[PDB]
Amino acid sequence: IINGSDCDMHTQPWQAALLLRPNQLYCGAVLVHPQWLLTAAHCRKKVFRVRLGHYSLSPVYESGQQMFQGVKSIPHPGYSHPGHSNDLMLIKLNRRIRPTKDVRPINVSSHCPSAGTKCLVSGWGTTKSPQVHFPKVLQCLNISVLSQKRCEDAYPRQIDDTMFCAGDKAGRDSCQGDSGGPVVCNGSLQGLVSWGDYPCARPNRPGVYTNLCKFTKWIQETIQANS
Ligand SMILES: *[C@H]1O[C@H](CO)[C@@H](O[C@@H]2O[C@H](CO)[C@@H](O)[C@H](O)[C@H]2NC(C)=O)[C@H](O)[C@H]1NC(C)=O
Ligand SMILES: [Zn+2]
Ligand SMILES: [Zn+2]
Ligand SMILES: [Zn+2]
């Protein structure tokens, strides 16, 4: 997250981090069900761990912490390179979460975001671009949803309704390391960090996020088919 601020503690209980030994965080994820996470399809990995209810980046022990193992990874069937449409994937935890003020799922909105909607995106990604610089703790940033028209103009021929743009204010954007992370609007999960221009936070170049309102039926049917 470029130009964000340390998140308040306990305000992102659905935020997750994906790690692959020792504790190298490669993507964020979002707890959307007592036993399911949602992350970007390009964040797929065979072996990895899931960390929930943990504020800092380093593996410093925290009381609210809860570690898990991903038993099943299911990317949306429409995901493809280099278009990157349908950039979402379901991950099943080995066991259900112990609900607490630290670890709590969030609902996925079925109503699509309209131009002007203020949303909050969080992550442990780099706070600088192109120079890499990781934060100490979870970063938060409010971004506003642009119109699908402007979105398409900014990235001609590389955008469809499976995504949406957000982040008008310059110097502020999501970046590498935030991928798979949540974009919350109106108390609901509206999107996942997917991609954007590079370097991050270039003026008039908004971040592109997975448009989750288009996948509620698939998400719920997939979870039920594996319960
Ligand atoms: C983005 O905007 C939201 C909403 O304006 C900010 O949330 C506000 O936070 C302050 C300080 O905690 C509260 O006094 C307000 O009540 C909150 N808004 C409301 C009315 O819900 C949020 O902090 C902003 N995100 C960041 C970190 O910039
Ligand atoms: Zn706590
Ligand atoms: Zn690709
Ligand atoms: Zn530092």
Q: What is the CATH number of the domain that holds 44?
A: 2.40.10.10
Residue 61 makes CB contacts below 8 A (sequence gap 6+) with: none
Specify the length of the chain in residues.
Answer: 227
Residue 137 makes CB contacts below 8 A (sequence gap 6+) with: 6, 7, 55, 56, 57, 124
Q: What CA–CA distance (Å, rounded) separates 16 from 105?
A: 10
Q: What CA–CA distance (Å, rounded) separates 143 from 156?
A: 21
Cα(85) to centroid of ligand 3, in Å? 10
Domain identity same for 203 and 225: no
Beta bridge partner(s), residue 92: 36, 72
| Catalytic (active site) residue 87 | yes
Residue 166: CB within 6 Å of ligand 1?
no
If we measure between CA atoms, which residue out of 159, 174, 4 comes closest to residue 82? 159
Residue whose tokens read 């590079």: 198
Q: What CA–CA distance (Å, rounded) separates 180 from 197?
A: 16
Residue 140: CB within 6 Å of ligand 1?
yes
Domain identity same for 70 and 181: no
| Catalytic (active site) residue 42 | yes
Ligand nearest to the CA of 83: 3
Cα(16) to centroid of ligand 4, in Å? 21
Number of domains in the chain: 2
User: What experimental approach yielded this model?
Assistant: X-ray
Domain identity same for 143 and 200: yes
DSSP letters of 57-120?
Answer: SS----TT-EEEEEEEEEE-TT--TTT--S--EEEEESS-----SSS---PBPSSPP-TT-EEE
Q: What is the H or E stretch that residue 2 is in?
A: none
Taking the CA atoms of residue 109, residue 111, residue 115 and residue 119 in that order, the dihedral angle to the nearest 10 degrees is -10
Beta bridge partner(s), residue 215: none
Residue whose tokens read 């919350």: 184
Residue 148, token pair as written in the block: 């699908």
Contact 105, 32 (CB under 8 A): yes
Type of residue at 222: T
Residue 116, token pair as written in the block: 């002007």
Residue 117: CB within 6 Å of ligand 1?
no
Residue 13 makes CB contacts below 8 A (sequence gap 6+) with: 31, 53, 100, 101, 102, 103, 104, 106
Contact 29, 43 (CB under 8 A): yes
Resolution stated for this PDB structure, in Å = 2.3
Residue 148 makes CB contacts below 8 A (sequence gap 6+) with: 115, 159, 161, 164, 165
Range of the domain at 149: 1-12+106-215
Residue 5: CB within 6 Å of ligand 1?
yes
Domain identity same for 7 and 110: yes
Domain identity same for 123 and 224: no
